């Protein structure tokens, strides 16, 4: 997994690869790692996948109920707190490593949340097994107050660095651009690798498999 985020002039750009692995085997080559928290807040997910999925879903659900009662859009700090205080309570056993990004009444905010319940508030962050590859790209080329298409390129470039150089990371590049005026959920943003073309057809012809018995039931 390679997930990353940057704060740019008008808002937030989040990024993620699409490779879900079990051990050394790739179970899904196009699996979504950017999650919905609220309409103005999204969350990239790394670490233990079930924990990542369920932690975001629960805080999203609770923020929806919070936002219905208050009648106003939720803030990134409250998303951050709710994730943070839960993950801390479970002392690292919920292996959720999140990049949380969104745009408030108070402007754009980006956080990294760790399994043990620590959070850093930053202009750029990277997480997952490809974080070092991605962070190299940000240390090389990041600057504050970037334009949108520039920031999009930098994040895409950082996710790519992870895709190629980290074995845990791969597949496509997903982005999520968040500003006051719009939310752009780009899946896929880039397809850096073509699917490998097979030279033979190995599918068997009808009647090749040996059957013992058959049963048909209609619905």
């Amino acid at each position: 997994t390679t997930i990353a985020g940057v704060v740019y002039k008008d808002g937030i750009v989040l990024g993620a690869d699409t490779r879900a692995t079990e051990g050394m085997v790739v179970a899904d080559k196009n699996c979504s790692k950017i999650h919905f928290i609220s309409p103005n807040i999204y969350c990239c997910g790394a670490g233990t996948a079930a924990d990542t999925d369920m932690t975001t879903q629960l805080i999203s659900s609770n923020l929806e109920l919070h936002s219905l009662s208050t009648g106003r859009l939720p803030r990134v700090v409250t998303a951050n707190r709710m994730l943070k205080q839960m993950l801390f309570r479970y002392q690292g056993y919920i292996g959720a490593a999140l990049v949380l990004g969104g745009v408030d009444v108070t402007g754009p905010h980006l956080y990294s949340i760790y399994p043990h319940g620590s959070t850093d508030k930053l202009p750029y962050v990277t997480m997952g097994s490809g974080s070092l590859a991605a962070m190299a790209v940000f240390e090389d080329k990041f600057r504050p107050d970037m334009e949108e298409e520039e920031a999009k390129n930098l994040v895409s470039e950082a996710i790519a660095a992870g895709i190629f150089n980290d074995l845990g990371s791969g597949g496509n590049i997903d982005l999520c651009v968040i500003s006051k005026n719009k939310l752009d959920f780009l899946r896929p943003y880039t397809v850096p690798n073509k699917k490998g073309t097979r030279l033979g057809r190995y599918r068997c012809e009808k009647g090749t498999t040996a059957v013992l018995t058959e049963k048909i039931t209609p619905l």
């Binding site: 919070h66 009662s69 208050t70 106003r72 803030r75 700090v77 409250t78 951050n80 707190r81 709710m82 205080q85």
Partner: peptide, 14 residues
């Protein structure tokens, strides 16, 4: 503490 921003007047009232 829970939500990380100051309680709004109306939210308290409710």
């Amino acid at each position: 503490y829970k939500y990380g921003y100051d309680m709004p007047c109306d939210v308290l009232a409710k």
